[PDB]
Ligand binder design. Sequence first.
Ligand SMILES: CNc1ncc2cc(-c3ccc(-c4cccc(C)n4)cc3Cl)c(=O)n(C[C@H]3OC[C@H](N)CO3)c2n1
Length: 295
Amino acid sequence: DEEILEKLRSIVSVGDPKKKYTRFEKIGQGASGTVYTAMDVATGQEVAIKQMNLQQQPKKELIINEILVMRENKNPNIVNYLDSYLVGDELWVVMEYLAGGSLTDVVTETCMDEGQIAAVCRECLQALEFLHSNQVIHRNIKSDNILLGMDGSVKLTDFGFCAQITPEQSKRSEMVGTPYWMAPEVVTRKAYGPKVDIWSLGIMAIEMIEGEPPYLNENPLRALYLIATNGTPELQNPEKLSAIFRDFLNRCLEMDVEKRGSAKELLQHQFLKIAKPLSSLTPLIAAAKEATKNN
Ligand SMILES: CNc1ncc2cc(-c3ccc(-c4cccc(C)n4)cc3Cl)c(=O)n(C[C@H]3OC[C@H](N)CO3)c2n1
């Protein structure tokens, strides 16, 4: 539709990004748009700005939903939305910049201890409880969508897959997410709710432990099957974890969705009490940065 397009233009302001932000520097290009860093002319605030041509973006309703969800669910543990500009046929989204980069670089290049893992999990749980209490299910939790402050702050990003639920319709059935991180009830097209994010967080904890989610050597289809039939995935070396960490994992990765913990009740688990200060993540950030210098 060109109706859905006009609906999108409708919620964005027509103005020049350069009027407020200067010093544009490209730090990457994704399937969606092009991503820059920049600076607030007046306050000196560092920002991340995505540049996106609508004429070539399929499924514009998703872009609309992503912008709308960001605007109305602002929170300490979510990369927060500053502004978006409409310039002719291109959309410019402006977000906080988190200089500590992505948790994926930390999980693939460093060894995290239990205190550091606990701190990250607590910060993610805080955003999930916030979202779940506002009827937003993220549906795409993974280290790739966790951004880090230079001070160790932990922030959830990418809401392009999120679903808003209501008492009229409180569950979903569609296979939405990234295969390795999808809860089994999602893989097998059952009615699911907010706790699919809890499962996905459990898989992110396995990233922090082992460097990868389960089945990453396999293809996504094969992984989907492996999740469907195996259920609670297996750790390469469970003996290396504390009793309380193992207990935390089991409760994130519980098959029974009613037994599986919610964000609120996992925020009380004893595993989180051994968390280190978030400042402890900065050496990890430095390591990840060094390890990924070449590429
Ligand atoms: C490396 N520090 C860092 N700090 C901060 C952001 C912030 C965003 C961001 C988030 C979300 C959106 C967004 C929000 C609503 C609608 C629409 C259409 N886009 C727009 C951007 Cl611009 C980013 O894309 N990246 C880069 C990315 O690279 C891929 C990785 N998986 C996540 O971070 C950031 N990177």
